[PDB]
Amino acid sequence: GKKMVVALGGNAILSNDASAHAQQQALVQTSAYLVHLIKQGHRLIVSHGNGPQVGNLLLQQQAADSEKNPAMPLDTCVAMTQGSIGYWLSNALNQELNKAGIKKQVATVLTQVVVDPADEAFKNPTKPIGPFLTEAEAKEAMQAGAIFKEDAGRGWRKVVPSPKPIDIHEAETINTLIKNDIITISCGGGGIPVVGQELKGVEAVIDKDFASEKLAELVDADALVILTGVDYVCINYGKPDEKQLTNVTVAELEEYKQAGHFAPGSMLPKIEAAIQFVESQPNKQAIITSLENLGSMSGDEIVGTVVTK
Amino acid sequence: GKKMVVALGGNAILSNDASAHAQQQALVQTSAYLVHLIKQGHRLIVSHGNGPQVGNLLLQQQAADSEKNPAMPLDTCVAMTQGSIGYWLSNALNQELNKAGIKKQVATVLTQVVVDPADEAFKNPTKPIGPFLTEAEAKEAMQAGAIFKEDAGRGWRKVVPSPKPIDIHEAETINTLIKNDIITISCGGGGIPVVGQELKGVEAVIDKDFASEKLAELVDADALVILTGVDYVCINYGKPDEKQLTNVTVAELEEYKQAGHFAPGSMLPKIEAAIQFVESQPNKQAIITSLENLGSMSGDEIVGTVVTK
Ligand SMILES: Nc1ncnc2c1ncn2[C@@H]1O[C@H](COP(=O)(O)OP(=O)(O)O)[C@@H](O)[C@H]1O
Numbered sequence: 331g332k333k334m335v336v337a338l339g340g341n342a343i344l345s346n347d348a349s350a351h352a353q354q355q356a357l358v359q360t361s362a363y364l365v366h367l368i369k370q371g372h373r374l375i376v377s378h379g380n381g382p383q384v385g386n387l388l389l390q391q392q393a394a395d396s397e398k399n400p401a402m403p404l405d406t407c408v409a410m411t412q413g414s415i416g417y418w419l420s421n422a423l424n425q426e427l428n429k430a431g432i433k434k435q436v437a438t439v440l441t442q443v444v445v446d447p448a449d450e451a452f453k454n455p456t457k458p459i460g461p462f463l464t465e466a467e468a469k470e471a472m473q474a475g476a477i478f479k480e481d482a483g484r485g486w487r488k489v490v491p492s493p494k495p496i497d498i499h500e501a502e503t504i505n506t507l508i509k510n511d512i513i514t515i516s517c518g519g520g521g522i523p524v525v526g527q528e529l530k531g532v533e534a535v536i537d538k539d540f541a542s543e544k545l546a547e548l549v550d551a552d553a554l555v556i557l558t559g560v561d562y563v564c565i566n567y568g569k570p571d572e573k574q575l576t577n578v579t580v581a582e583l584e585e586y587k588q589a590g591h592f593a594p595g596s597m598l599p600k601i602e603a604a605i606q607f608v609e610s611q612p613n614k615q616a617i618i619t620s621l622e623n624l625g626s627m628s629g630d631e632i633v634g635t636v637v638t639k
Numbered sequence: 640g641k642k643m644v645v646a647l648g649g650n651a652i653l654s655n656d657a658s659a660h661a662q663q664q665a666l667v668q669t670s671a672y673l674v675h676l677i678k679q680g681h682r683l684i685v686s687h688g689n690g691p692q693v694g695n696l697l698l699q700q701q702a703a704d705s706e707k708n709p710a711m712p713l714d715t716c717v718a719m720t721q722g723s724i725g726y727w728l729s730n731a732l733n734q735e736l737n738k739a740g741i742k743k744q745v746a747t748v749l750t751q752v753v754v755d756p757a758d759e760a761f762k763n764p765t766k767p768i769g770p771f772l773t774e775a776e777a778k779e780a781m782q783a784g785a786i787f788k789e790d791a792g793r794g795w796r797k798v799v800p801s802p803k804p805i806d807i808h809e810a811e812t813i814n815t816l817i818k819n820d821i822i823t824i825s826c827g828g829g830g831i832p833v834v835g836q837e838l839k840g841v842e843a844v845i846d847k848d849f850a851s852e853k854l855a856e857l858v859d860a861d862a863l864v865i866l867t868g869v870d871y872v873c874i875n876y877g878k879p880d881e882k883q884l885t886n887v888t889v890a891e892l893e894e895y896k897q898a899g900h901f902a903p904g905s906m907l908p909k910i911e912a913a914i915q916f917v918e919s920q921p922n923k924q925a926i927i928t929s930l931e932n933l934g935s936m937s938g939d940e941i942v943g944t945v946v947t948k
Pocket residue numbers: 338339340341379557558559560562563564565566567591592593595596597598
């Protein structure tokens with residue numbers, strides 16, 4: 331069996347219906363697939379994204395904003411989504427483990443992810459968040475310290491930094507749970523962004539896959555498994571000559587990267603994080619595939635885009 | 640030292656406004672007092688309430704309620720507050736620990752607290768919660784069985800049950816962290832209420848002190864310390880003949896309780912929880928006092944209303 335960090339994405343909470351019940355139902359389906367990994371002897375360390383969840387929460391912050399009910403900053407909103415999604419996922423996993431007759435503890439740990447204040451991302455925030463405000467509301471926010479950028483035609487929306495994760499505060503706690511064979515859920519939404527030894531909260535968005543890769547390094551995982559919306563990373567994706575990548579090496583991926591095969595923002599971060607993990611220490615593996623593709627496992631072997639040195 | 644469950648209440652988050660920043664600063668002050676206990680060798684396992692926090696979150700759920708941004712049910716909102724408050728408190732405690740030069744890690748574990756569906760509370764809900772609705776809105780909201788009661792002159796509110804905890808799902812995980820000298824924050828808001836084999840969420844409010852007492856039993860804590868708004872519990876409270884209770888036995892408290900000295904909904908549950916803990920096992924002590932009164936500690940000994948038997 332392998333100790334693996336499993337980084338869930340949007341596909342893990344595929345529901346369309348934004349209700350808690352619909353998202354919980356989606357996570358139960360996701361958990362059924364994850365339990366396949368447990369049946370095969372793997373030791374899971376799970377993380378997840380929070381795109382639509384934090385997006386809706388941010389809209390809720392604005393809808394009721396007042397002196398008595400002030401909008402919560404982004405870092406607190408991320409913490410809230412670690413709570414909601416962590417609850418839904420841990421609950422769903424327990425259900426599916428029970429259905430399989432398997433006894434295994436699941437626990438969600440709030441996770442603060444440290445970033446460098448000197449990170450170039452802070453001088454140049456590029457992550458748009460929240461609702462589209464009017465120039466007026468924008469200028470008012472500007473005078474309030476926020477950085478807004480008019481999205482020509484759509485309006486003005488707040489932009490925040492996307493810094494690199496340099497450490498996971500709760501890493502040792504997560505390691506402790508790991509060693510006690512407890513399935514942990516952490517780094518939700520890429521983590522609650524904090525800076526410095528004092529762990530000062532900041533409004534930023536940390537890439538979930540790089541946060542997961544940092545966790546994988548800190549807990550000395552054997553593999554980083556990113557589960558997304560495709561069974562295999564492809565070259566010429568969506569094109570007539572599309573080709574699925576199975577076993578790949580870093581040099582191969584670097585060649586394809588320069589040819590522009592991995593869309594920025596979506597697949598590119600996964601490829602970069604996977605390469606980084608494989609380059610971090612000898613005998614490390616990274617896999618990019620989907621939950622559904624776990625049905626194609628060969629024994630305890632996960633198939634998909636498998637990256638090695 | 641002694642393994643002690645410290646149950647924080649409203650005054651632990653003493654802020655002049657409801658902003659995240661103000662509440663975080665309030666928790667920093669609270670953490671200063673908690674560090675005092677840690678310096679004295681006590682092994683802390685902390686819990687907290689969430690009344691004002693979940694209240695504002697529920698108002699945010701209502702403000703943007705729509706098909707695309709549906710209001711999250713109470714159990715999910717409780718999970719979200721375990722995330723926000725857990726983040727604020729763990730971050731504040733780390734800051735105060737570092738200031739004291741103490742190398743101790745803090746971790747927040749989402750907590751699902753199990754209740755019995757046959758609990759009398761489900762037949763007679765008593766906890767009003769959420770927004771004040773019109774009579775027409777409440778009428779429609781009650782068709783599926785939910786109970787709404789009119790608050791004359793204010794509106795109609797949902798009234799949920801306050802069932803007793805029969806288990807803390809993550810208890811073993813929390814104990815494992817405790818055994819590894821990690822300060823845990825759990826049972827936030829009394830816990831995410833769940834029922835049955837699938838741990839289905841239910842809209843209810845589990846008393847934070849009863850939840851904390853159950854945790855104290857499950858982790859075999861030496862003491863249950865409830866920190867609230869008074870330095871000492873009193874009899875003839877607010878009357879000219881008011882008397883503060885210091886060392887007191889279970890028998891004495893039972894007499895006082897029967898005399899109606901402890902207000903329902905506020906002090907009564909703390910007294911009942913204290914009695915339950917002292918009677919739960921030999922060599923168990925329960926204390927009810929305030930964070931401020933910790934400044935009057937005699938060495939590693941906490942003064943206040945100390946229950947023994
Ligand atoms: N070369 C490529 N091969 C496969 N999928 C690709 C490629 N380039 C872009 N994609 C897209 O990247 C998506 C996954 O990234 P993203 O949408 O960000 O998902 P997640 O929520 O998992 O982060 C795929 O599901 C696919 O639509």
